[PDB]
Write an enzyme that holds these catalytic residues in place. Structure first.
Site, PDB file in Angstrom:
ATOM      1  N   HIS A   1       0.915  -1.528  -0.164  1.00 23.35           N
ATOM      2  CA  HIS A   1       0.276  -0.317  -0.145  1.00 23.35           C
ATOM      3  C   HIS A   1       0.915   1.264   0.159  1.00 23.35           C
ATOM      4  CE1 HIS A   1      -4.427  -1.966   0.428  1.00 23.35           C
ATOM      5  NE2 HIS A   1      -3.516  -3.119   1.588  1.00 23.35           N
TER       6      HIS A   1
ATOM      7  N   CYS B   1       0.208   2.176  -6.198  1.00 23.74           N
ATOM      8  CA  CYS B   1      -0.780   3.099  -6.502  1.00 23.74           C
ATOM      9  C   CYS B   1       0.106   4.029  -6.920  1.00 23.74           C
ATOM     10  CB  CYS B   1      -2.251   2.849  -5.422  1.00 23.74           C
ATOM     11  SG  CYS B   1      -3.433   1.799  -5.968  1.00 23.74           S
TER      12      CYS B   1
END
Ligand SMILES: CCCCCC/C=C\C=C/CCCCCCCC(=O)O[C@H](COC(=O)CCCCCCCCCCCCCCC)COP(=O)(O)O[C@@H]1[C@H](OC(=O)CCCCCCCCCCCCCCC)[C@H](O)[C@@H](O)[C@H](O)[C@H]1O[C@H]1O[C@H](CO)[C@@H](O[C@H]2O[C@H](CO)[C@@H](O)[C@H](O)[C@@H]2OP(=O)(O)OCCN)[C@H](O)[C@H]1N
Ligand SMILES: CCCCCCCCCCCCCCCCCC(=O)OC[C@H](COP(=O)(O)OC[C@H](N)C(=O)O)OC(=O)CCCCCCCCCCCCCCCCC
Ligand SMILES: CC(C)CCC[C@@H](C)[C@H]1CC[C@H]2[C@@H]3CC=C4C[C@@H](OC(=O)CCC(=O)O)CC[C@]4(C)[C@H]3CC[C@]12C
Ligand SMILES: CC(C)CCC[C@@H](C)[C@H]1CC[C@H]2[C@@H]3CC=C4C[C@@H](OC(=O)CCC(=O)O)CC[C@]4(C)[C@H]3CC[C@]12C
Ligand SMILES: CC(C)CCC[C@@H](C)[C@H]1CC[C@H]2[C@@H]3CC=C4C[C@@H](OC(=O)CCC(=O)O)CC[C@]4(C)[C@H]3CC[C@]12C
Ligand SMILES: CC(C)CCC[C@@H](C)[C@H]1CC[C@H]2[C@@H]3CC=C4C[C@@H](O)CC[C@]4(C)[C@H]3CC[C@]12C
Ligand SMILES: *[C@@H]1O[C@H](CO)[C@@H](O)[C@H](O)[C@H]1NC(C)=O
Ligand SMILES: [Ca+2]
Lengths: 104, 184, 331
Positions: free
Chosen positions: C126, C168
């Protein structure tokens, strides 16, 4: 206890050869309530007593299921530093009477 | 002091009581909650500044003796009362039993009542915090519906009220002295 | 035409719990590929933050799958992990990269590369714009990674390096690189910041991310004796199969990507030399076993417990002191 075992010798060429391998099969189901083996002479349990986030107790249960013989046991416990112990509260009771350890 | 310490050595033939008592008081290793100002501060501390902050917060207790002795030279008993209150407020492991001792002295100083200001609100606040300690302890530790911030807020309010009350008494004393010397 | 003589790999997963199955699956796929193409298990440093193969919630124990057909298990029969769940941290990763490791650390858990070594680094987790999160407590920034790679270059601990990140906004993590001979690839650009969510029914979780899925599919056809260059991995997962846009930075690198093979970084091809030389050589007391639980000896190994009493000298001192004080104020 007197136990009987069946032996398969893998080095015997009667048992295992180039042209035939070995697969052993065994018929077993849970026996009826009668004819079940008796429970072992010794077993134990452990649990935590109380509720909340301040104080509690650690408890152990020891079973002797032999009909007529008494035998001694040696018990070893380790506890981390964060759970501070008070040794003046240690109690050992058998059948509602106090039991005094031989060694501590 | 010397004789008492040397006599204490011979009960168990060791010097181990000394770090266990005075080192414990001075270093504050245990973080059990109380009504003081140290526990939550040192459970939420950056390790770089811990030594500096413990030194500051234990100098604070011994700090006020000298200027207070300069001002209150002719009034030793009022000086004693103030010093006892300071010790009770700013010690490392405080208890309500320490608080009761200086509250026992309030009747001696109640001839200063006319010069007191904001006494009512301070008394009410102290009384409220006293009852709010157990309820919030219960809600944090047994119900699980609250956290440590409630308890920390109550401790903060209690200590602030104590400080304000002591300052009020000191002001009233000085005002009466001024009126005695110069005229009402 | 490469000029290296050994290969290394560091593969890291920085997630936690059971619902983060995807990151572990990606790492396992990379491990399977690099082993199949030739890199030995002693030259791979594998760090996994949580266990998904033998988690008690797993409907199929000792398996991790990439697709719902369940035709490829990426955990495999043969696997070895160096760093377990509680030894994966930003600090340990930086120590492994820089070589500043505690003295007692064993050989298998350190990276012993030199001037003639190609290294592959892969990361997943993440992340955001300029950072990647380890578990949930801490993070590593792009500046720190760029500094660690320069530390590695100054001691000449690699020949060429390939860095791949699947996160991301992953392109932010290779923007500050300034050391020679580094090539970097990413899955998404700075703007692209959402993540997909389609859980698998039988298992109960989302299985694997798209980019690594297509990258692993292109590495399943490559064999040890392949002639594929690094220009073919630059065209994998076009925005149409993924919904984000992959990027690459190859301006710090000295060779042309049309001449860089895939196995230079994903496999192990040795340089071999035939040997044609030779060195001439002229032609009464028996021993016993210990006793388990000797009761009487245990009972007698400790002196008996007597109750404690204050010493007499202390009593004499106390009362002498008290009466000596009393004889002053009274006489
Ligand atoms: C009278 C003169 C007073 C003198 C000085 C005043 C002192 C006390 C008086 C008032 C309070 C001021 C100081 C209070 C500060 C701390 C207390 C607090 O605010 O917390 C709240 C307590 O509730 C109360 O205060 C009132 C209840 C009863 C007390 C009465 C007050 C005194 C009454 C006495 C007299 C009354 C009448 C007498 C007259 C007769 C509890 O709320 P909560 O925990 O939910 O919120 C916190 C937190 O909120 C704050 O603290 C406010 C911030 C500033 C407050 C300071 C006040 C400014 C000035 C006051 C003026 C007073 C007068 C002075 C002048 C004289 C804060 O915002 C958050 O940071 C905090 O964390 C939050 O907790 C929760 O928030 C997070 C989100 O839920 C969560 O974080 C976790 O989760 C995130 C995931 O999203 C993660 O990102 C995080 O990493 C994190 O970790 P996680 O992964 O979840 O791990 C979880 C593992 N457990 C937190 O978990 C969560 N707890
Ligand atoms: C263990 C504790 C240690 C005790 C030390 C032993 C000595 C005991 C002294 C007896 C008390 C005593 O002296 O009473 C009388 C005292 C002292 O005499 P004095 O008339 O003031 O003369 C000096 C002035 N000028 O006169 C006073 O100054 C009055 C105050 C009395 C002091 C308290 C009595 C001591 C008894 C113990 C009680 C302590 C509580 C526990
Ligand atoms: C009366 C006041 C003003 C000070 C004078 C009192 C002294 C008689 C005492 C007070 C503190 C004591 C010291 C406190 C701690 C130590 C550490 C101690 O070191 C140990 O050996 C402790 C641990 C161990 O036994 O391994 C040796 C004695 C010493 C110096 C003590 C010696 C005697 C001291 C100086
Ligand atoms: C009234 C005046 C003249 C003297 C009063 C006595 C104090 C000055 C002495 C008496 C006992 C001393 C303590 C005895 C033992 C220790 C432990 C020693 O080592 C520790 O274990 C420190 C604690 C820690 O760092 O964890 C540090 C000093 C300290 C607190 C001493 C600090 C000074 C103390 C409080
Ligand atoms: C009149 C005498 C008591 C001197 C005046 C008071 C202060 C100037 C001194 C006296 C005793 C000192 C304390 C003695 C022992 C300690 C423990 C010491 O703890 C450690 O070093 C352990 C590690 C840590 O917790 O940081 C920190 C400083 C502190 C609180 C000292 C802070 C400064 C104090 C309060
Ligand atoms: C003499 C008295 C009355 C006042 C002087 C203040 C004394 C008690 C205080 C003030 C600053 C303190 C020091 C501050 C920091 C350190 C560093 C470390 O080593 C722990 C103790 C030590 C060395 C402290 C010892 C006690 C200290 C010297
Ligand atoms: C095992 O192989 C041997 C040689 O073919 C054969 O004689 C023997 O019968 C086989 N096993 C049995 C049935 O004993
Ligand atoms: Ca390894």
């Amino acid at each position: 206890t007197r136990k009987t075992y069946a032996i398969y010798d893998l080095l015997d060429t009667a048992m295992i050869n180039n042209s035939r391998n070995l697969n052993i099969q065994l018929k077993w189901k849970r026996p009826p309530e009668n004819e079940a083996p008796p429970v072992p002479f010794l077993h134990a349990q452990r649990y935590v007593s109380g509720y909340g986030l301040q104080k509690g107790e650690l408890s152990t249960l020891l079973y002797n299921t032999h009909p007529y013989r008494a035998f001694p046991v040696l018990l070893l416990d380790t506890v981390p530093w964060y759970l501070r112990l008070y040794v003046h509260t240690l109690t050992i009771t058998s059948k509602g009477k106090e039991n005094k350890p031989s060694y501590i | 002091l010397v004789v008492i310490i040397c006599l204490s050595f011979f009960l168990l033939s060791s010097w181990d009581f000394i770090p266990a008592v005075y080192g414990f008081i001075l270093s504050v290793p245990d973080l059990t909650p109380n009504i003081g100002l140290f526990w939550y501060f040192f459970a939420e501390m950056f390790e770089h500044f811990s030594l500096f902050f413990v030194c500051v917060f234990q100098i604070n207790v011994f700090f006020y003796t000298i200027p207070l002795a300069i001002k209150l030279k002719e009034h030793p008993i009022f000086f004693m009362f103030i010093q006892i209150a300071v010790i009770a407020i700013f010690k490392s492991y405080p208890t309500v039993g320490d608080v009761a001792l200086y509250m026992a002295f309030f009747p001696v100083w109640n001839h200063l009542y006319r010069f007191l200001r904001n006494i009512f609100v301070l008394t009410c606040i102290i009384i409220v915090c006293s009852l709010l300690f157990p309820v919030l302890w219960h809600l944090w530790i047994y119900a699980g519906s609250a956290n440590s911030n409630f308890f920390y807020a109550i401790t903060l309010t209690f200590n602030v009220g104590q400080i304000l009350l002591i300052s009020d008494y000191f002001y009233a004393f000085l005002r009466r002295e001024y009126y005695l010397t110069h005229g009402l | 035409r490469s000029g290296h003589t050994n290969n290394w790999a560091v593969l890291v997963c920085t997630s936690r719990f059971w619902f983060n199955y995807r990151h572990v699956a990606n790492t396992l796929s990379v491990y399977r590929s690099v082993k199949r193409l030739g890199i030995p298990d002693s030259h791979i440093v594998l760090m996994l933050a949580d266990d998904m193969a033998c988690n008690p919630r797993n409907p199929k124990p000792a398996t991790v799958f990439s697709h719902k057909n369940m035709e490829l298990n990426v955990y495999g029969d043969d696997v070895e992990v160096d760093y377990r769940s509680y030894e994966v941290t930003v600090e340990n990763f930086l120590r492994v990269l820089t070589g500043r490791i505690p003295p007692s650390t064993p050989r298998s858990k350190r990276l012993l590369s030199d001037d003639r070594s190609n290294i592959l680094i892969y990361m997943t987790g993440h992340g955001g714009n300029g950072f990647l999160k380890f578990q949930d407590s801490e993070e590593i920034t792009n500046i720190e990674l760029a500094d660690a790679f320069e530390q590695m270059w100054q001691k000449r601990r690699y020949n060429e390096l390939l860095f791949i990140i699947d996160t991301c906004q992953g392109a932010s993590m290779y923007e500050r690189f300034y050391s020679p001979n580094i090539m970097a690839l990413a899955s998404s650009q700075v703007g692209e910041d959402s993540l997909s969510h389609q859980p698998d029914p039988a298992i109960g979780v989302h299985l694997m991310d798209r980019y690594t899925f297509y990258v692993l599919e292109f590495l399943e056809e490559i064999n040890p004796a392949s002639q594929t260059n690094m220009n073919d991995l630059f065209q994998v997962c076009p925005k149409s199969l993924c919904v984000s846009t992959p990027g690459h930075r190859t301006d710090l690198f000295q060779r042309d990507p049309k001449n860089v093979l895939i196995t230079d970084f994903f496999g192990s091809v040795r340089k071999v030399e035939i040997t044609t030389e030779t060195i001439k050589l002229q032609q009464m007391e028996p021993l016993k076993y210990a006793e388990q639980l000797p009761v009487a000896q245990i009972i007698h190994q400790k002196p008996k417990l007597k109750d404690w009493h204050p010493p007499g000298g202390f009593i004499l001192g106390l009362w002498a002191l008290i009466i000596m004080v009393f004889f002053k104020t009274y006489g």
